PDB file of C-alpha atoms in Angstrom:
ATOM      1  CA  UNK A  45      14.988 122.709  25.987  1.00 41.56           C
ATOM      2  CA  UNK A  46      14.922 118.985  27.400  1.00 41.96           C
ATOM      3  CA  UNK A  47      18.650 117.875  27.077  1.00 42.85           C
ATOM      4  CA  UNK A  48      19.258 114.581  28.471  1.00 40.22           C
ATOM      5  CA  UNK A  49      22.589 114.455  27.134  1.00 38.53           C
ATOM      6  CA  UNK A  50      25.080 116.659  29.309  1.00 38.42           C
ATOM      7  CA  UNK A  51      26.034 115.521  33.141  1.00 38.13           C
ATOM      8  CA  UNK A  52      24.694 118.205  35.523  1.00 36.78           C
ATOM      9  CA  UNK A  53      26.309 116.521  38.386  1.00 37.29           C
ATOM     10  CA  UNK A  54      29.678 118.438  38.365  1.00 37.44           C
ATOM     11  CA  UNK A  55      29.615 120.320  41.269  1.00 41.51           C
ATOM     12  CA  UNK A  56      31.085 117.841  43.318  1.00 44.27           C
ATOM     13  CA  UNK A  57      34.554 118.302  41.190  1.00 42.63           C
ATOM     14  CA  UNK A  58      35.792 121.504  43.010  1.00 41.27           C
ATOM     15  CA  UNK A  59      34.864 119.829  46.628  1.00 39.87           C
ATOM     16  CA  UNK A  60      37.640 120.472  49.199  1.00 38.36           C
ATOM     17  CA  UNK A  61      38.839 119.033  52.036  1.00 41.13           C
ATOM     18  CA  UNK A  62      36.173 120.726  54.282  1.00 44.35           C
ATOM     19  CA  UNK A  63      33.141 121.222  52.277  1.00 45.72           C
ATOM     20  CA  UNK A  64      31.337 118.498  54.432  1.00 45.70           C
ATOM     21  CA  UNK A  65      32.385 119.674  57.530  1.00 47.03           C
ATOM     22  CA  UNK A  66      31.630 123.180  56.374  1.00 47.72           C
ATOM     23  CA  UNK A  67      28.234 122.141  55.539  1.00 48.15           C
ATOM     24  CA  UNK A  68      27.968 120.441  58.727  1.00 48.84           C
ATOM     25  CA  UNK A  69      28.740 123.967  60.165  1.00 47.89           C
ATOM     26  CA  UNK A  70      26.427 125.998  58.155  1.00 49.44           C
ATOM     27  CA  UNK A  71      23.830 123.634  59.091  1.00 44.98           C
ATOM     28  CA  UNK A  72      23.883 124.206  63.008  1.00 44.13           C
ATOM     29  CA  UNK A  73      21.399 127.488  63.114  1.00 46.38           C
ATOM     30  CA  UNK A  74      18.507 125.319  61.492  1.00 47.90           C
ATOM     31  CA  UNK A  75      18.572 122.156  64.194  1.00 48.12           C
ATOM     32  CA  UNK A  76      16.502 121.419  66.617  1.00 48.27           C
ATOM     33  CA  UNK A  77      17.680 122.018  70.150  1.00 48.08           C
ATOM     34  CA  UNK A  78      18.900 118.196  71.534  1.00 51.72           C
ATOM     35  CA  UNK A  79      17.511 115.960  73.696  1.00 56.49           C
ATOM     36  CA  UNK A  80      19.092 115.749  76.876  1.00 53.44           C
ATOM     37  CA  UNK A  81      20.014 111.916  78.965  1.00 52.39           C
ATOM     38  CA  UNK A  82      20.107 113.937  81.846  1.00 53.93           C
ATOM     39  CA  UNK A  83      23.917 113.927  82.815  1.00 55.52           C
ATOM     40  CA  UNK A  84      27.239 114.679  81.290  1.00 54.47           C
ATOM     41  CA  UNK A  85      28.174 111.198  80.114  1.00 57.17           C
ATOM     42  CA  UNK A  86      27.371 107.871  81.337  1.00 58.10           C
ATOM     43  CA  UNK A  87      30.326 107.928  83.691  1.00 58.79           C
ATOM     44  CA  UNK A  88      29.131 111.159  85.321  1.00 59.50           C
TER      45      UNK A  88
ATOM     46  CA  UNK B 735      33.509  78.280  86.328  1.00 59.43           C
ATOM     47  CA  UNK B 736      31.846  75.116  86.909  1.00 60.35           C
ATOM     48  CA  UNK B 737      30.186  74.418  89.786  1.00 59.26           C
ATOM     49  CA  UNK B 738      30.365  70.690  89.471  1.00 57.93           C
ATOM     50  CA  UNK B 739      32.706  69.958  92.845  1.00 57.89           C
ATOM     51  CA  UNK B 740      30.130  72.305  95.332  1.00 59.90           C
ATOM     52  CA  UNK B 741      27.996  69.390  95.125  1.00 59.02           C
ATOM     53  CA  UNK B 742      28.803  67.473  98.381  1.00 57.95           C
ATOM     54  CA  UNK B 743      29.401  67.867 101.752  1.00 59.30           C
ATOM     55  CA  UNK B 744      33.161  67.229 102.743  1.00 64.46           C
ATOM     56  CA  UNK B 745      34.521  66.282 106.192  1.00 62.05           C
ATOM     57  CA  UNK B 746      38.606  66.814 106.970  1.00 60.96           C
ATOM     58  CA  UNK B 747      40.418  67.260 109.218  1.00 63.52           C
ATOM     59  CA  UNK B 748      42.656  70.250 111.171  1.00 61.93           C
ATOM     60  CA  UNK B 749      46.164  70.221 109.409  1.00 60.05           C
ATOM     61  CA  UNK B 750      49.465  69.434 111.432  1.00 61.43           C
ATOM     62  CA  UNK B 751      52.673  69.880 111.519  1.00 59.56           C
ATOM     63  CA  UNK B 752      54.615  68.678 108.008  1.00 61.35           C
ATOM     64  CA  UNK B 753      58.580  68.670 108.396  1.00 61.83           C
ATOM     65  CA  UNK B 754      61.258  68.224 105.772  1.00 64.44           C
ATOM     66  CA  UNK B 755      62.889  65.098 105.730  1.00 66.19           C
ATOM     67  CA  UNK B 756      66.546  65.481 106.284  1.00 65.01           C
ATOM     68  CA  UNK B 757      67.636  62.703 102.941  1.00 65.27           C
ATOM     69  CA  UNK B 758      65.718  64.063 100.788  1.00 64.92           C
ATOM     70  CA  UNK B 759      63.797  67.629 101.747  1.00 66.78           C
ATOM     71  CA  UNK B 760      60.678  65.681 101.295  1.00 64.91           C
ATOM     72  CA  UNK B 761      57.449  66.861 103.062  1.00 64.72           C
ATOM     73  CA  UNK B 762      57.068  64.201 105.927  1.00 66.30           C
ATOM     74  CA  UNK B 763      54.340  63.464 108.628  1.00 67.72           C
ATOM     75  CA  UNK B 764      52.917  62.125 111.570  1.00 66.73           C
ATOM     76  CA  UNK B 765      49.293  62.893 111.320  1.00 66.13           C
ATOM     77  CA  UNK B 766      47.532  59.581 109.931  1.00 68.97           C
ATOM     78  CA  UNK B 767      44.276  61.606 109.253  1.00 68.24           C
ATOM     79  CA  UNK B 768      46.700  64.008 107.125  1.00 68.56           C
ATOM     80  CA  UNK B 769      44.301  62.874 103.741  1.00 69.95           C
ATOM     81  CA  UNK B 770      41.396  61.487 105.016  1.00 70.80           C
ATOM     82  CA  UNK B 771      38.362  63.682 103.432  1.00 71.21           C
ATOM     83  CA  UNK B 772      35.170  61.765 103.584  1.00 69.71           C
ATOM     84  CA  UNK B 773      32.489  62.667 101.051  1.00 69.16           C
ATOM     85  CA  UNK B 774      28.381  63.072 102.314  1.00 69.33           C
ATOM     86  CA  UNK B 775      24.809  64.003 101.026  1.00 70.52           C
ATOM     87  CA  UNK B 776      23.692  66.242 103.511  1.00 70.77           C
ATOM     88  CA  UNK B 777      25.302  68.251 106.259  1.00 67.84           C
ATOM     89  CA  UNK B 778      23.416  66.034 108.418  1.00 67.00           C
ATOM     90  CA  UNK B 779      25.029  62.664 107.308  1.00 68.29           C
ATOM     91  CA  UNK B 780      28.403  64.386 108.164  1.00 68.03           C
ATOM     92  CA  UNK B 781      26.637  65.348 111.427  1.00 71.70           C
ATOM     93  CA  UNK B 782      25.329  62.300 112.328  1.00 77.22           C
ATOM     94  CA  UNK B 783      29.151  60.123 111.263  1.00 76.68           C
ATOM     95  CA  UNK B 784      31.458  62.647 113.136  1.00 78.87           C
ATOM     96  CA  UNK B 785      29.114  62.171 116.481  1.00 79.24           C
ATOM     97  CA  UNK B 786      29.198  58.569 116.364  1.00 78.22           C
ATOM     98  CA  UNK B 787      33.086  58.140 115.655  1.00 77.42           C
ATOM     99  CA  UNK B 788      33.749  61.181 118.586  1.00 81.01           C
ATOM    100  CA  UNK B 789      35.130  63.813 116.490  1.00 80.30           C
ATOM    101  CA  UNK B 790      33.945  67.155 117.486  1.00 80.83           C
ATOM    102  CA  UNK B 791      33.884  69.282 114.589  1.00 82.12           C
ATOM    103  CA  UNK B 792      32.661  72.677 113.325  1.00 82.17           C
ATOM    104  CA  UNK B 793      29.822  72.817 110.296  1.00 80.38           C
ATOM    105  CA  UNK B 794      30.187  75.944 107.966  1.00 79.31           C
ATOM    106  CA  UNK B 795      26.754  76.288 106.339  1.00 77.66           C
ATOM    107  CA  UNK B 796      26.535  76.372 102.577  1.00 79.03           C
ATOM    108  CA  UNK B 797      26.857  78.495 100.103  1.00 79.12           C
ATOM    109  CA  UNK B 798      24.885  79.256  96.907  1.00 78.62           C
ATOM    110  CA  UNK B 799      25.521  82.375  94.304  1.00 80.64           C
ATOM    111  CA  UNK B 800      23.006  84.946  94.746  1.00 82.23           C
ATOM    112  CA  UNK B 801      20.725  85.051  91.604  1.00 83.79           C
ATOM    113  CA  UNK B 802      21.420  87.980  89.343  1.00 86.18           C
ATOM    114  CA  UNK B 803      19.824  89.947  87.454  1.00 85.37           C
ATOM    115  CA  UNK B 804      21.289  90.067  84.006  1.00 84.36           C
ATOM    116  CA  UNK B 805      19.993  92.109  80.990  1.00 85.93           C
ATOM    117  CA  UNK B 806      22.193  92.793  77.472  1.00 87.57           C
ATOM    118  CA  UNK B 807      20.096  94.978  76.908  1.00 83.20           C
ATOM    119  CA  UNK B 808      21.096  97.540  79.966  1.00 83.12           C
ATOM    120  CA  UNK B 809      24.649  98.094  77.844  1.00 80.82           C
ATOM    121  CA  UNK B 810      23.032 100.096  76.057  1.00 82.70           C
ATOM    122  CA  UNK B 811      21.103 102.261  78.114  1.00 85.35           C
ATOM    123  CA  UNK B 812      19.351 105.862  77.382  1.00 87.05           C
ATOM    124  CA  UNK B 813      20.494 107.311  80.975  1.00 83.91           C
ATOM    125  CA  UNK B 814      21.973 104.967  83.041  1.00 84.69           C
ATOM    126  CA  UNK B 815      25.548 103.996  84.034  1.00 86.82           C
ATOM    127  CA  UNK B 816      25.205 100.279  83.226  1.00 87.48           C
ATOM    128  CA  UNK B 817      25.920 102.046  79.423  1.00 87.79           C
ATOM    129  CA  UNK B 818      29.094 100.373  78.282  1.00 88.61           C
ATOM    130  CA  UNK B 819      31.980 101.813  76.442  1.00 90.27           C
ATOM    131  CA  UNK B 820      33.134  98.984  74.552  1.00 92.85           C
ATOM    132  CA  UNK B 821      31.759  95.337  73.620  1.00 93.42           C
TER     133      UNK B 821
END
């Protein structure tokens, strides 16, 4: 049934202090593997 | 930073002894040439007026800044160290 009277954007209400950074986390085993500059840091 | 007074050639002299006078502690003198800077076009007006007058003198050759190579854009290089930290 089309309802287009209820907010279905509540999931955000029981975020914590870490669910971006835990999302962040979960997210590593999908990336691609980074480019590379070709040293450590730019005052290597 | 401005460049305005490395115009001209300058001619002086070699310094000499200043004393302090006894009065007063001032700085006193006996070189009569102790000020004299004489302004020219070319090092070879200075030349040309310290041979006729019988001054020997010494000629340091000029010099100019090297041109540089500037780029803003190498702050914020891919790979190199030129990368800057901080603007």
């Amino acid at each position: 049934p089309f309802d287009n009277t209820t907010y279905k954007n509540l999931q955000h209400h029981d975020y914590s202090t870490y669910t971006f950074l835990d999302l962040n986390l979960d997210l590593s085993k999908f990336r691609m593997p980074q480019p590379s500059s070709g040293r450590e840091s730019p005052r290597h | 930073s401005g460049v305005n007074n490395t115009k001209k050639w300058k001619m002086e002299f070699d310094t000499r002894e200043r004393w302090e006078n006894p009065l007063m502690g001032w700085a006193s003198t006996a070189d009569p040439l102790s000020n004299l800077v004489l302004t020219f076009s070319t090092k070879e007006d200075a030349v040309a007026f310290a041979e006729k007058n019988g001054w020997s003198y010494d000629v340091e050759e000029r010099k100019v800044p090297k041109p540089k190579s500037k780029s803003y854009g190498a702050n914020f290089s891919w790979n190199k160290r030129t990368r800057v930290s901080t603007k």
